[PDB]
């Protein structure tokens, strides 16, 4: 259960799991997440910016 | 002696539909030989108030299934003119599984229907009658058209119908395969060239009906008996059956009987006497009876213990928690998969839902899937209660009564045959580990 | 089970707006008579018969037929599409010459309708959603057709064939494909909705005119 | 008077246009239809 | 006057004849749940979310289409009304897709909000859901019809407000779909408003897709300068 350095994960196929719902951005108590998204070239809903300020993050 | 306590043996002289089996000429001359179109001019000249009163005192209730008192319903249209034409719409959709009486009336006694249209339209002040017949009844529709052509040639209908100075037209309209178009508002929408989707009430058709004009929707059987009630007296009609359950009724006995048939009988006949006398009894004897759906698929079923003394009228069948409906008796003996039959009915309702409103459109398909899983035993007993609640969420919450009529058989099956469901569930459970 | 058919239209060489369809002049006279039945100012009320008339002339309902009906009755084509897709008697896909409908609802299910269905399937060699390669028979299941008293039964092109047995339906099928046309009705020596044997009611001759008329009228 | 025979045998020779032909024949007997005042609700 | 007296939860209200139960309820600040009713569209009565209990009446009535009678007492928060709302929301969510994270209607959904305020919190639906193919009606309106709840708001808007009769319903029962039945573009100078009237993500804005969430946005009230309508 240990909480340490953040990471973005993938599906087994190698496609990114993130779909830019921005739930993590809305729940972040420190406002440490910044997200920008747009339709990808194939139409997939994917982020273009995903930033985490680790000096704002309370882990 | 007055105040009869036994009902169910009426002789041929008191039967309204004297050509139910098509043994006599259904044409105009044959119908006149049977007493049709007799003193119609006098009945029209009596006036709409006299006809409405004669219908009222007859105690007649709607033969479409809901059993609404016909006199009040037809007097709802006794308002003065407001610039809009007034119309009579005769329901001939005949969509209930188990029901075949309207087809026999139309194909064998069409002049009774035409004269009923004329008399009812005069009573309501209607300008014309639209007969909405099922699209599958092509031969019946053409027979009705031939009868209407003969009535027009005769001068019975149309301008100066009979010789009373009243102009009345009778049109025939054919649907295209939709049971929901039996609903009065859905039927009205179907006539107007839209989808057969019911309207909300209010307004009632007596205020806003077909083409936005005052309209009354009546069953073919209800309309057909009107001239006989006017002629023979109406008080003669009330002499049959119990109080508030008066007259004669056409019954369709189908399913597990020796001789499935359409018959005419006194209203308050016991169910057992009806099945024994006319249908030849249950297949394999009365002890082989398992269940009966008394009034078509929309009515909850009853087991053999209830069928022993039940009377075949509205109030008695309400006391048995099933209702009279269309008086279509579907009989199932002990060799049938009753869960499968109820699932087939639910699948019928799933395929006949118009999909307009959320409770029907969703819950009926949900119950269909649940009953399909129940048939194989692929569920757990708790879901039974769940299914019950699902039906309770559909009943009373839809636009039209199709949701009610889809929930009712499920409720009847759960009420009377829960141990069968649990036995199937446990058999599937230990069969599949 | 499920619907199976689709409720969207995709263009196709055999079904597209340029597909040739038009009403025959006698069919135009029939359309005029149909339209005359309804009040002036309410012409959409004639979409149900006229569209059906098209299906009688053509055998099915292409998109061009729907467009023609909409143009004739001066209604939006979407309303005609809604009517065509709502009602199951309309064929938005070509069907065989003899369209066989088998009722499988509970009253007919009780009187061995599955035997009739499987007899038809094994006689024709096609399933419940297929047409014969010679395009003479299309078989489907339907809901209650209104003749439960005469179960089991099928409908073939505006005709009822009731009180069926597998031999009876096989005979009907093999007579139909020989170029003839079988007589409709029950195939059990009953020819009505009467009880199978005995005629328990209506045995007496019908009463004459004015038999029970009340006094004062 | 007889009951051994079936009298509804005319529907054995009905074609696909019988209903509409009957409607055309009946067209001459009908009263003039009422008018709503417009050609269509979209007018 | 011509006003008649009705009661909302026992409070007297004076309303003009022809006022519906919904308008009488909103005359005291009570907003009845709704999905298919729009005050600028014709009444539909199909969603059934607005069902409310009238005192001494066994049947609940559709508040969006039911004119108030004299002396009626509307019970907007009785057990019958709450149970009706829960059942209707259960039916609505039975076949709805689990699309909220990828749906642009995420924080702006009437379905979501009315599920949180009037529906239950669990699901007892143990079957498979239905799936509907998408329809292309142009570059402005993105269509994902699995999220459609068949309120027919778009159809009424097109037919009445826009004067375009291209939208409708095909099929019946559970497999009833809203569309054009043909590959047809829905071009109208007011075609984008169907995005706003649609309570769910079935109709969304294509240029706006995936770029923002409603809670991030700051709202500035301004005036349009693209014409002289202002
Ligand atoms: N014969 C058939 O093929 C079928 C028959 N049914 C039967 O239909 C029955 C339910 O039909 P519904 O029309 O929904 O019943 P309902 O109770 O709502 O009304 C039936 C008739 O009474 C009139 N009516 C009722 N209340 C009225 C009022 N307050 N003011 C004026 N008029 C009023 C209605 O206009 C209608 O014509 C079912 O019980 C079923 O047995 C159902 C399916 C098929
Ligand atoms: C789903 C549904 C289907 C119906 N189908 C029919 C039908 O086929 N024939 C019919 O007469 N009534 C049908 N009804 C009820 C009609 O409203 C009824 O015929 C009409 O009220 C006339 O009743 P009356 O005979 O009391 O005048 C149906 C009702 C519902 C809810
Ligand atoms: S935006 Fe955040 S919560 Fe949403 S999928 Fe991506 S990482 Fe998960
Ligand atoms: S209950 Fe079913 S058939 Fe009746 S209006 Fe609602 S969806 Fe249509
Ligand atoms: S429309 Fe609303 S409820 Fe449906 S998936 Fe989108 S956010 Fe969720
Ligand atoms: S697309 Fe939206 S507005 Fe149109 S019917 Fe579906 S849910 Fe209603
Ligand atoms: S159940 Fe087969 S005709 Fe009705
Ligand atoms: S808001 Fe009343 S039924 Fe939809
Ligand atoms: Mg939207």
TrEMBL record, chain A:
Residues 9-38 form the 4Fe-4S ferredoxin-type domain. It is found in: Mitochondrion inner membrane. [4Fe-4S] cluster 1 binds at residues 18, 21, 24. Disulfide bonds join 24-28. It comes from the Eukaryota. [4Fe-4S] cluster 2 binds at residues 28, 57. Belongs to the complex I 23 kDa subunit family. Core subunit of the mitochondrial membrane respiratory chain NADH dehydrogenase (Complex I) which catalyzes electron transfer from NADH through the respiratory chain, using ubiquinone as an electron acceptor. Essential for the catalytic activity and assembly of complex I. This is NADH dehydrogenase [ubiquinone] iron-sulfur protein 8, mitochondrial. It comes from Sus scrofa (Pig). The lineage of its organism: Eukaryota, Metazoa, Chordata, Craniata, Vertebrata. The gene is NDUFS8. The chain holds residues 96 to 154 of 212 of the full protein.
From TrEMBL, chain B:
GO terms for molecular function: 4 iron, 4 sulfur cluster binding; FMN binding; metal ion binding; NAD binding; NADH dehydrogenase (ubiquinone) activity. FMN 8 binds at residues 64, 94-95, 184, 219, 222. [4Fe-4S] cluster 2 binds at residues 354-357, 360-361, 400, 403. This is NADH dehydrogenase [ubiquinone] flavoprotein 1, mitochondrial. [4Fe-4S] cluster 5 binds at residues 360, 400. Its EC number is 7.1.1.2. It comes from Sus scrofa. The keyword Membrane applies. FMN 5 binds at residues 63-64, 73, 91, 94-95, 184, 219.
TrEMBL record, chain D:
It is found in: Mitochondrion inner membrane. Complex I is composed of 45 different subunits. This is a component of the flavoprotein-sulfur (FP) fragment of the enzyme. Belongs to the complex I NDUFV3 subunit family. Accessory subunit of the mitochondrial membrane respiratory chain NADH dehydrogenase (Complex I), that is believed not to be involved in catalysis. Complex I functions in the transfer of electrons from NADH to the respiratory chain. The immediate electron acceptor for the enzyme is believed to be ubiquinone. May be the terminally assembled subunit of Complex I. This is NADH dehydrogenase [ubiquinone] flavoprotein 3, mitochondrial. The chain holds residues 68 to 110 of 110 of the full protein.
TrEMBL record, chain E:
[2Fe-2S] cluster 2 binds at residues 36-37, 46-47. It is found in: Mitochondrion inner membrane. It comes from the Eukaryota. Mg(2+) 11 binds at residues 200, 203. [4Fe-4S] cluster 4 binds at residue 149. Mg(2+) 4 binds at residues 105, 200, 203. Mg(2+) 5 binds at residue 195. Mg(2+) 6 binds at residues 195, 198. Mg(2+) 10 binds at residue 200. [2Fe-2S] cluster 3 binds at residues 36, 47, 64. [4Fe-4S] cluster 2 binds at residues 96, 100, 103, 109. This is NADH-ubiquinone oxidoreductase 75 kDa subunit, mitochondrial. The chain holds residues 29 to 258 of 727 of the full protein.
